Design a protein around this ligand. Structure first.
Ligand code: HEM
Ligand code: HEM
Ligand code: W82
Ligand code: W82
Ligand code: H4B
Ligand code: H4B
Ligand code: ZN
Lengths: 411, 407
């Protein structure tokens, strides 16, 4: 079967065959679409077919499908599974798997970059201190003094689910949030729960509005341990506006390195529960979501007051006016400090080229419109007008429950 | 199977049971989501009629009543006999209001029960259709105090006698391809502007020429009619800050009146059912004015604003986009023509959703269409999980008539 998608701005039509290789389920049925739903201990039984399919993919990509190297690897993995109940990926396979998990990430607009991913193998790590060392090296490498480089660090895979490696931080670099007795929040409201865990674990909170959270690292299923990222490794950008001199006095900054650390990396049926990865920011992630979500720093009103817009009627679009200026400031500040950032116009245009290229060389590109379209100025970006097909391919990044909800404490 | 939708800004969780009553298919499967795809006999009829009559009599709290069973029998008699049936006026009004209520792509559904339904099922000619449409337009426009309305022409019989309005909207601006190479007026209507000229129309070849109506009654060739200009309420677009905005020469019409959809009630098909409400500001300012395939004024506006258009990262497009949409709202509000901004309309829809979940068990909703085309995440609908499913009565798409008309 074949499936067509149309760009309604350009009339370019693309044909998807790649969805045929999709096995995992979407959440939708013939009778309900769950496309806007945020989120809709594995035995040898199901593992060898997952390994075989991955190794077929791997050896096909290197033009060795059916070779003796391919057949020998299949044999070797089979015997390792039935004898040890799991198996170890070769370095080349791990790198391939991590790159393709990114390539397959249908919610990621930044995938044109997928093949230039730096993969750090941390599968020999055994302790939380070792994890901290690997993560520091990741941050330093990825940050590269502002010339950001994509990277992923891969800690040992799950064994029986009782010895998991986990990074308890949702991102490697994030600001604390503190609930005050008067009901207000200081810092990032998204991080109040995690901040409280850190404090309970012994973290001495500075209780400011932009406190970089400590790392909370769990090795081999043991209780997690606290570590402070060396401050010289945390590149931050003070936010100023190119026309509004009062904007700096808002006291805003952000960190340069977006580094997601709570997802699970699935490769050939193996589960890597700690696999922090990093790229560089699209400006709206900070300017629209981090700063202007009502549930986050929520600076629209203070910015709009300082711009002296008509704030009495929403049809003045004072929120839309302030939002644009804030996002101009974020982009101006990062570029002025020579920290890598991409605006949503450039990013979505690159994604369309990537997607067309993927349809030609690969037969498709799974894409989640709900997430790909940026959270401001949607229809003046080319992705808004692009039909997209969403389906799940493996290798993949998956969500996993927050570890404090599942962890068995040792004491 | 009893599904939950979460609002991630407010943590409000609603439980949807209405989707289990859904019948038609979404285009999605368990292996592939098509949420962003724009367009995915005697025996079939009686279950359709039964399903509809059942919900009608339930809604008036007469389920399982004498009148319910009688009407079920009478329609059953009529289908066995005539191979179709006719709706009572009460059922027709109910069916049209619920077609709107069920329109999962419509953000303006909080108004669904205040729809004025005009029964035009006695219409037989295109001149009669024109007359009904003029009355609709005058009633709906209401000197700028817009009122929702639908006019329902006779239902399909054998598909040879269809009533169709060939316009996609009752009021739209013409589109002309220049010898110079580009497009004058609305590029989206270049083909329809051709079919009007290629049928008799005499075009002013301006930038904002109201298109004539092309009306097809009973399957005959469609006929041209000019809507009386005094019935077409237009708003000149000015900005409450930039005096040069007026010189751009922009205007738009006040009445959004979709005329090319098909209304399905109880299995009966109404191929000509123009309906109208009032605009959300972004439909004009974001889509009509700033789409690259439409009037595409962003460059000229940014030029007049003297923004740095060298690099995309100056967000000059975004800045211009905001000012254009401030002016649209300002112009309509100043001329006392009903319009709603995207902030108000999406707040209304969240309120509508909670109402529908409370009193009905759910609300089918298409996030890809509901979230406005600018400033998405500062509107509450962006953070609202939505379930999309197809209920009937419904409005459906249908092929353009010129691709079907046995001429
Ligand atoms: C290189 C520059 C990159 C850019 C500009 C970028 C951009 C984005 C953005 C804006 C999102 C939306 C998520 C949100 O709004 O919270 C996203 C999602 C995602 N990205 Fe990328 N990304 C980049 C690199 C990467 C890398 C290196 C990886 C993995 C190796 C990755 C994997 C993903 C995944 C798995 C998601 C799904 C998010 C989720 O489901 O919550 N991205 N990306
Ligand atoms: C009264 C104020 C109304 C507002 C503010 C409103 C708003 C909207 C908007 C913004 C859209 C998106 C369509 C697009 O972007 O092209 C839409 C779609 C739609 N509206 Fe409403 N509308 C209103 C009244 C009505 C009425 C009276 C009906 C029918 C009786 C209706 C039926 C629909 C349908 C069927 C769609 C989706 C059609 C499609 O798939 O393109 N609307 N509406
Ligand atoms: C509602 N989000 C909850 C949630 C939970 C767990 C993970 C994520 C998440 C996952 C991602 F891969 C990406 C994001 C955006 C942050 C981000 C990451 C990267 C690598 C580049 C970029 N430019 N930006 C967020 C989000
Ligand atoms: C990409 N659209 C293609 C297409 C084709 C056929 C019909 C439509 C369409 C259908 C609708 F019910 C509504 C619209 C927006 C116009 C509109 C209509 C009404 C009643 C109120 C409003 N405020 N606005 C457009 C759209
Ligand atoms: C309800 C909805 O699915 C949710 O708000 C999504 C919408 N699209 C998004 N898109 C991106 N990139 N990031 C997000 O967090 C979200 N949130
Ligand atoms: C491809 C995509 O489905 C298409 O551009 C849609 C996106 N969402 C939309 N939403 C609304 N309200 N109106 C539209 O025309 C569209 N177009
Ligand atoms: Zn779907």
């Amino acid at each position: 079967r074949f499936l067509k998608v149309k760009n309604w701005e350009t009339d370019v039509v693309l044909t998807d065959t790649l969805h045929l290789k999709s096995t995992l389920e979407t959440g939708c049925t013939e009778h309900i679409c769950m496309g806007s739903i945020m989120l809709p201990v594995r035995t040898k039984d199901q593992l060898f077919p997952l390994a075989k399919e991955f190794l077929d993919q791997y050896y096909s990509s290197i033009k060795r499908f059916g070779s003796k190297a391919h057949m020998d690897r299949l044999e070797e993995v089979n015997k390792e599974i039935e004898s040890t109940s799991t198996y170890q990926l070769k370095d080349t396979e791990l790198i391939y798997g991590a790159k393709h998990a990114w390539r397959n990430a249908s919610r990621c607009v930044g995938r044109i970059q997928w093949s230039k991913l730096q993969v750090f193998d941390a599968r020999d790590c055994t302790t939380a201190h070792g994890m901290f060392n690997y993560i520091c090296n990741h941050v330093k490498y990825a940050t590269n003094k502002g010339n950001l480089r994509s990277a992923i660090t891969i800690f040992p895979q799950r064994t029986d689910g009782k010895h998991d490696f986990r990074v308890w931080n949702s991102q490697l670099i994030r600001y604390a949030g503190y609930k005050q007795p008067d009901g207000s929040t200081l810092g990032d409201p998204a991080n109040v729960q995690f901040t409280e865990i850190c404090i309970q674990q012994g973290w001495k909170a500075p209780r400011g509005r932009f406190d970089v959270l400590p790392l909370l690292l769990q090795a081999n299923g043991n209780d997690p341990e606290l570590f402070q990222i060396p401050p010289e490794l945390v590149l931050e950008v003070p936010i100023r506006h190119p026309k509004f001199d009062w904007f700096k006095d808002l006291g805003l900054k952000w960190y340069g390195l977006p580094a997601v650390s709570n997802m699970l990396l699935e490769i050939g049926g193996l589960e890597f529960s700690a696999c922090p990865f990093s790229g560089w920011y699209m400006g709206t992630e900070i300017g629209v979501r981090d700063y202007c979500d009502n549930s986050r720093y929520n600076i629209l009103e203070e910015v709009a007051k300082k711009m002296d817009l008509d704030m009495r009627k929403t049809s003045s679009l004072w929120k839309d006016q302030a939002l644009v200026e804030i996002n101009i400031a974020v982009l101006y500040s990062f570029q002025s400090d020579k920290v890598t950032i991409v605006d949503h116009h450039s990013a979505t245009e690159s994604f369309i080229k990537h997607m067309e290229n993927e349809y030609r060389c690969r037969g498709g590109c799974p894409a989640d419109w709900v997430w790909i379209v940026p959270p401001m100025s949607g229809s003046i970006t080319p992705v808004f007008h692009q039909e997209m097909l969403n389906y799940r391919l493996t290798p993949s990044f998956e969500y996993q429950p927050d570890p404090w909800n599942t962890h068995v404490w040792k004491g």
